[PDB]
Structures are given as structure tokens and as C-alpha cells.
Design an enzyme around this catalytic site. Structure first.
Site, PDB file in Angstrom:
ATOM      1  N   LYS B  86       1.050  -1.317  -0.021  1.00 42.92           N
ATOM      2  CA  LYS B  86      -0.314   0.068   0.134  1.00 42.92           C
ATOM      3  C   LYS B  86       0.602   1.214   0.148  1.00 42.92           C
ATOM      4  O   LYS B  86       0.346   2.021  -0.856  1.00 42.92           O
ATOM      5  CB  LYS B  86      -0.705   0.068   0.897  1.00 42.92           C
ATOM      6  N   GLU B 108     -10.314   6.020   3.982  1.00 49.23           N
ATOM      7  CA  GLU B 108     -11.101   5.010   4.873  1.00 49.23           C
ATOM      8  C   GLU B 108     -10.081   4.133   5.407  1.00 49.23           C
ATOM      9  O   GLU B 108      -8.901   4.503   4.706  1.00 49.23           O
ATOM     10  CB  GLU B 108     -12.491   4.936   3.066  1.00 49.23           C
ATOM     11  N   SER B 376       2.434  -9.941  -1.082  1.00 49.12           N
ATOM     12  CA  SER B 376       1.803  -8.256  -0.940  1.00 49.12           C
ATOM     13  C   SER B 376       2.169  -7.633   1.014  1.00 49.12           C
ATOM     14  O   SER B 376       2.382  -6.027   0.778  1.00 49.12           O
ATOM     15  CB  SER B 376       0.529  -7.924  -1.242  1.00 49.12           C
TER      16      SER B 376
END
Ligand SMILES: [Cl-]
Ligand SMILES: [Cs+]
Lengths: 257, 394
Positions: B86, B108, B376
Site C-alpha cells: 500500500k 478510509e 503483498s
């Protein structure tokens, strides 16, 4: 049927603006909501704007988010809302009825099928909260094929190309939200032959209704002040109706300029 | 009217209230000019390299494929600053926000990982950051809340609705429709209204660019398939993007199967959902027969998004990528197997991708195949979850 045209014709001959309450269908229960709506009409509402409970109303504030939860608690489904709409139209043949929808409920069983059902139960207009004018082609085409007025919001940040689209694509009325001066927004909208504009931003008091009419708008929508009366008075249903009746008749007297 | 196509085939679009359209048009214009700006590209690359730790390693697994003809490589986004992929895109969106002259960030989060990523990017670049979180997710992820507060972010709980991620996605948009002159909405995945599926893909695409150069260097050929988990779609499309034209490379996305598809408790909208319109896009989603939006279920909090990016649905429909599912138990077994044989603790999200790779290898152990899994993130954040399940079982 063209209930909006008739309504606006009669209002203009008696130098009146329209008062339009918003209320969620089935809040706080199906039978009590039907009571609330018959009370609103009886006290002088010129037209109704009705919401269908949706799981994820991203265009709404907290008063309406809680109205939806109350209706979901009561077990309200879209199919029941459409049952309620037929009863309302059977009791009140002339009042314009507009739905405030979210796109997924319109899309769910087919866009055309949705507007076909509206025309069957006698709905006059549909506003789809999360469909901008740029994405609206399949929705307003389906609306027009089934004699339903497609309603568009004209927001405060509207530029000229938006005004031109809203004026061309909308029917019934233009939903007005309140940098640009207000009375020239009504002016440009009348310039472009838009459907009559109803002011729908923070309409809480009789003085705001009067201000909207004097500013050039055909009336006002009270988008949440009515849901708040329902919220405050949830424990006493008979005080809820009396408070709704006094408020609505106050707000509608204000529209007589 | 937009500069780029807001649709991938029939999926995507800009299904937002009218009031938000100018914010989206401003963002797309800023993105397009940023992409043509060598100095933006250099600042972004500088932060990725010297702050986030790129390029990440491509590790060949030594032990896990023993006794098969599979060669498995892991793209090590677990080694990125923050411990998950991310970080790549929040750095790009934060530079974009500065480029537009914005000074505040809205985001969010559900599992808390995007909230942490948003807060660390905001502290580095001098942006004021407010984060919306569902109050159920707040209570269950108080480690990540403390992290966000340490980094100067203001955390705001949402009790509206189910008080989960999707209800966080709504209150962020409401805030933005009023604040977008000074605030940027840092959406956390490759979904939502255009231009976000496009922006987030482009700010994650270095994953596949690096992977391609690294595998050509080590094996002299392209992989047979690249496999990635799919929550909203950012890490998968970041891995896939640079391989889309290399048509000999399989693209495999792994949705969470939860307790199993046939139970209805899963998070696999792409293959077992239904097209609808929510969160600004037309895409497959978890919904009831009446059109209400349900939650996904997965043991991995980070795959909790009830829809999927529209480019993935496009890629599936034309047959360029294949999507499969992996259940909680399969991902848990893959979690244990990587720890014991490779000494790497993977995120439970990434374990879904690994679990499919192990299934490919085990079902056909004499098939020669070169596989890359996008690891990830790391799994330190999951050890308590894994621990409780293993004690509850024995
Ligand atoms: Cl490195
Ligand atoms: Cs998902």
C-alpha cells in the site's frame, strides 16, 4: 398524467410556491409511515419526495442514514415500498410523487423494468442520487420512455455547461442546492428553460420558504427537517403527527407570498 | 467529459453525486499532467527508493517446491516500508495532493493498513490527515489506531450502517464533497470512481515492472503465471499491468473463499457476485437479491472489500486474466508452510495467493512451471489471529 405541470399551473395562479417534504418510506414502520404521509398531505404538502431505504446512501447526511436504519429494522424492502406507493397513489390521485433513489436499486432488476414499475404504480419523477448528468443517458432515456420525469440536482459548484445539461435533460422540476449567487442561478435556469427550480438546501423554517419564493424559485424541499421531527418524537406517535401537522402547515403558509 | 476513458469495457464509470464531479475532474487533470512531468516522476522515484525501500527483492523459494518441477519466486512487497504494498500508491497520491495545492488528506480504512499507510505518507510530506474507520474495525484493530495516532493522524470512528469498511467509504466521500478545495481523498484500492482505478494502478505498476526485469535477469524468461490476491485489486493490478501484453504469461487473481463459496460466507464478488452500482463504479459486488450491499467475509481483514476493481472484471470478461478462490483453511496452511520452510511470515492476505500456487504445484507435481507470487505484505500483524485459531483447534 402531468402532475407537476398541473401543480405549478395552479400554484402560479394563486401566487404560491410549492412546499415539498422529504420522508423515507417505511420510517419508522410501514403503517406509521403511511400515517405520516397522509398527515403531511392533509396539512398542506404540495408534492412528496420519498426515499427508498438503501444500504449505502453515500449522498446523505446522518439524519437520513438513521431513517434508513429505522426502516431496515422494520423489515422494509423495495418491493414493500412499491406496494406502499400504490396505496398512496390510490388515496391521493393528484399529488406529484417523486422518488429519491440510489443507482443500484434502479439497476438491480433492469433499468427499464424499474421505470416500468414506477409508471405502473403512478410515480411522477425519479432522482437518482449517485448518477451525475454525465452518466445519466440510460436512466433518463428509460424514464422518458415510461413517462417519468428525470430529476437532476444543480449543486452550488455548478458551472455553465452543467446548467445547460440540467436544463435540457431534466423534467418536472430542478432540484436546487442553495461559488455562485443564488438568484442568478435561478436566472440562468429560467434563461435555459429549465424545469421550475425547487430550493432544497437547509430549508428548516418558514422564513427560508418565503426567501426561496421571493428569490425566484417555484418552491422549497425540506430535505431533512421532517425526518428530525420523526426522530425526536419516536416514542409518542400521536405527538409526532401533531408536530408534523403544525410544522408543515406553518411551512406551507410561508409559501403564500 | 474526461481526458481518459472512465470505463474498462462495461465496468467502471463515475457514479457519484453531481457535487463531487468537479473534484474528480480536477484530480484526473492533475494526474494526467503529473504523468507527463519528469520532475514529478523523479520525486516519486526518489521517495520509493530512499524512503520506502524499492526495488524490493524477488526471492526464489528453496524448500517449498521440493520434489516437484515448479520454480516459485516471491516478489517481496513484505519488505516495503510499512510491511505492505500500500505504501507505493499513498506516496504517489500524497505527492499528487501537494501538486494540486492541497494540504489535508482524507482516507478510509477497515483492517487499518491503509490508514497507517495514509498517516505515514501524510507525516512525511507535511499533510494533515484525517481517517475514517468503522467502529467495529476500530475496536478490533486498536494496534493500528495507536499507530495512526503516533503518526499525527486524526482517527474518526463510524457507527453508521454496519460500521465497517463500506460505511467508512461513505463518510469519507461526504467529507470530501464539502472539503475538496483544500483536501484530497486518498482512496485505498484500485476501485471507486474514475480516475482512481487508473491512478492506483499507475502508482502500483512498478511491482510488475520490477518483477519482469528481475525474472528476466534470474531465469532468462518470463514466468508462466503471476499470482496475486484480490481484495479491492491494487496489488494484483500493480503486478499484472506490465504483463498484460505478454500474452504467454498467465494472470491469476485469488479472491478470498472464506468458509467456502457454497456457504455464502466468502469475499469473492468477481466470480460469485453480481454486477451493480456502488462506491462510484459499475462492478461485480456482494449484494442481496433486493440490491442491498453485503459484506465480504474472510479470515484476512485486508480482503474485506465487498466489490472489486473494474479493470479486473474487464480482464476476466475478455479472458486475459483468470480468477480463483482460496478458503480460510487453505490460506492458513499456506501461512504455516512458508514460515516453516522459508522463514518468511506472510500476511494472511498474501497467503491466499501462495495457497493457490501450492495447489498448482501439488496437483500436477511433474508439470514444469515458473510461478511468481506477489507477497503483498508481511504477517506480523496476523500472528495473534493465527495463534487463536491454532489453539482453538489443537
Ligand atoms: Cl533494496
Ligand atoms: Cs473483494
Amino acid at each position: 398524467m402531468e402532475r407537476y405541470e398541473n401543480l405549478f399551473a395552479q400554484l402560479n395562479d394563486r401566487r404560491e410556491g410549492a412546499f415539498v417534504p422529504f420522508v423515507t418510506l417505511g420510517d419508522p414502520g410501514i403503517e406509521q409511515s403511511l400515517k405520516i404521509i397522509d398527515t403531511l398531505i392533509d396539512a398542506g404538502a404540495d408534492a412528496l419526495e420519498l426515499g427508498v431505504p438503501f444500504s449505502d446512501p453515500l449522498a446523505d447526511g446522518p439524519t437520513i442514514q438513521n431513517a434508513n436504519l429505522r426502516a431496515f429494522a422494520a423489515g422494509v424492502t423495495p418491493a414493500q415500498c412499491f406496494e406502499m406507493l400504490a396505496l398512496i397513489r390510490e388515496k391521493h390521485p393528484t399529488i406529484p410523487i417523486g422518488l429519491l433513489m440510489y443507482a443500484n436499486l434502479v439497476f438491480n432488476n433492469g433499468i427499464d423494468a424499474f421505470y416500468a414499475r414506477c409508471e405502473q404504480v403512478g410515480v411522477d419523477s425519479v432522482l437518482v442520487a449517485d448518477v451525475p448528468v454525465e452518466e445519466s443517458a440510460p436512466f433518463r432515456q428509460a424514464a422518458l420512455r415510461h413517462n417519468i420525469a428525470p430529476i437532476f440536482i444543480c449543486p452550488p459548484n455548478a458551472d455553465d455547461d452543467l446548467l445547460r445539461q440540467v436544463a435540457s435533460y431534466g423534467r418536472g422540476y430542478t432540484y436546487l442546492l442553495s461559488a455562485l449567487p443564488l438568484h442568478h442561478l435561478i436566472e440562468k435556469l429560467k434563461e435555459y428553460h429549465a424545469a421550475p427550480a425547487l430550493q432544497g438546501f437547509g430549508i428548516s423554517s418558514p422564513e427560508q420558504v418565503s426567501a426561496a419564493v421571493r428569490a425566484g424559485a417555484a418552491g422549497a424541499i425540506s430535505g431533512s427537517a421532517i425526518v428530525k421531527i420523526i426522530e425526536k418524537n419516536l416514542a409518542s406517535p400521536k405527538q409526532m403527527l401533531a408536530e408534523l401537522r403544525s410544522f408543515v402547515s406553518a411551512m406551507k403558509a410561508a409559501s403564500r407570498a | 467529459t474526461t481526458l481518459l476513458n472512465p470505463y474498462f469495457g462495461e465496468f467502471g464509470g463515475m457514479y457519484v453525486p453531481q457535487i463531487l464531479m468537479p473534484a474528480l475532474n480536477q484530480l484526473e487533470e492533475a494526474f494526467v499532467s503529473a504523468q507527463k512531468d519528469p520532475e514529478f516522476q523523479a520525486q516519486f522515484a526518489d521517495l520509493l527508493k530512499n524512503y520506502a525501500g524499492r526495488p524490493t527483492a524477488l526471492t526464489k523459494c528453496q524448500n517449498i517446491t521440493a520434489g516437484t518441477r515448479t520454480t516459485l519466486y516471491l516478489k517481496r512487497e513484505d519488505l516495503l516500508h510499512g510491511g505492505a504494498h500500500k505504501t507505493n500508491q499513498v506516496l504517489g497520491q500524497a505527492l499528487l495532493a501537494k501538486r494540486m495545492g492541497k494540504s489535508e488528506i482524507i482516507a478510509e480504512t477497515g483492517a487499518g493498513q491503509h490508514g497507517v499507510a495514509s498517516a505515514l505518507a501524510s507525516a512525511l510530506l507535511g499533510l494533515k490527515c484525517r481517517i475514517y474507520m468503522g467502529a467495529k474495525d476500530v475496536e478490533r484493530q486498536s494496534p493500528n489506531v495507536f499507530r495512526m495516532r503516533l503518526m499525527g493522524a486524526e482517527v474518526i470512528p463510524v457507527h453508521s450502517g454496519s460500521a465497517t469498511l463500506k460505511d467508512a467509504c461513505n463518510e469519507a466521500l461526504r467529507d470530501w464533497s464539502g472539503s475538496y478545495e483544500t483536501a484530497h481523498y486518498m482512496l485505498g484500492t484500485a476501485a471507486g470512481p474514475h480516475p482512481y482505478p487508473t491512478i492506483v494502478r499507475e502508482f502500483q505498476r512498478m511491482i510488475g515492472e520490477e518483477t519482469k526485469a528481475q525474472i528476466l535477469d534470474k531465469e532468462g524468461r518470463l514466468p508462466d503465471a503471476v499470482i496475486a490476491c484480490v481484495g479491492g485489486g491494487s496489488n494484483a493490478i500493480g503486478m499484472f499491468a506490465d504483463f498484460i501484453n505478454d500474452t504467454s504469461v498467465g494472470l491469476i487473481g485469488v479472491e478470498p473463499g472464506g468458509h467456502g463459496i457454497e456457504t455464502g460466507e466468502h469475499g469473492a464478488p468477481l466470480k460469485h457476485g453480481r454486477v451493480g452500482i456502488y462506491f462510484g463504479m459499475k462492478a461485480p459486488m456482494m449484494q442481496t437479491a433486493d440490491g442491498q450491499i453485503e459484506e465480504s467475509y474472510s479470515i484476512s481483514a485486508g480482503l474485506d472489500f465487498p466489490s472489486v476493481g473494474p479493470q479486473h472484471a474487464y480482464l476476466n470478461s475478455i479472458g486475459r486474466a483468470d480468477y480463483v478462490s482460496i478458503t480460510d483453511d487453505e490460506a492458513l496452511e499456506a501461512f504455516k508452510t512458508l514460515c516453516r520452510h522459508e522463514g518468511i511470515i506472510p500476511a494472511l492476505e498474501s497467503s491466499h495467493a501462495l495457497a493457490h500456487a501450492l495447489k498448482m504445484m501439488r496437483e500436477q507435481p511433474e508439470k514444469e512451471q515458473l510461478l511468481v507470487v506477489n507477497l503483498s505484505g508481511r504477517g506480523d500483524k496476523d500472528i495473534f489471529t493465527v495463534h487463536d485459531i491454532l489453539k482453538a483447534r489443537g
